[PDB]
């Protein structure tokens, strides 16, 4: 079995891009954060604790456009009980066609690795956007790096990457740009 079903007809032509959540699109914390964007109750061993989520600047512009250009898949090493609520509040346009959590990662030498080869998509039409180079150790030529984000609101990295994804969404083989 593959992690993903066959892409729907309106997606199958598009490149797949797997998008990381934490420190890529948002940063969360159990330490209280004033003026948080979202707060999400998460049960850990029976006790509910509040998780304070901040949105990386320009994430809404980023997700709305990316959902047009690609078959976008959320792929995080975190747990669904936290990620699904976060994704529900972020994805206001239905950009994520699927969501993949910790149990879909491969544990490789102390790191959770996103094994793109188990997606079920031609790797020449797959990209990964992740703040941890360790997450894409098996497919480094499929990767678009982004710096980890925590709380810098001057950050514009998602905004600055859009013209580059515009190019990538139109090639036939992403390796022609990322070098085979």
């Amino acid at each position: 079995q593959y992690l993903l079903p066959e892409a729907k007809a309106q997606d199958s032509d598009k490149i797949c891009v797997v998008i990381n959540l934490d420190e890529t699109l948002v940063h969360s914390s159990f330490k209280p954060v004033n003026n948080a964007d979202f707060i999400i109750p998460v049960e850990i061993d029976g006790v509910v604790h509040q998780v304070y989520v901040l949105k990386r600047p320009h994430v809404d512009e980023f997700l709305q456009r990316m959902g047009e250009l690609f078959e976008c898949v959320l792929f995080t090493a975190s747990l669904a009980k936290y990620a699904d609520p976060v994704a529900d509040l972020l994805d206001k346009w239905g950009a994520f066609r699927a969501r993949l959590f910790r149990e879909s990662c491969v544990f490789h030498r102390g790191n959770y690795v996103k094994d793109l080869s188990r997606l079920g998509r031609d790797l020449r039409r797959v990209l990964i956007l992740d703040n941890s180079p360790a997450s894409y150790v098996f497919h480094p030529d499929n990767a678009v790096p982004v710096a980890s984000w925590f709380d810098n609101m001057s950050d514009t990295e998602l905004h600055d990457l859009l013209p580059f994804f515009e190019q990538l969404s139109r090639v036939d083989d992403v390796y022609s740009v990322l070098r085979q």
């Binding site: 990381n20 959540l21 934490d22 420190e23 969360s28 914390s29 998780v51 995080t76 090493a77 975190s78 936290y82 544990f107 102390g110 790191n111 959770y112 941890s132 360790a134």
Partner: peptide, 6 residues
């Protein structure tokens, strides 16, 4: 949260 290691 998405941990580097468990």
């Amino acid at each position: 949260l998405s941990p580097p290691s468990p």
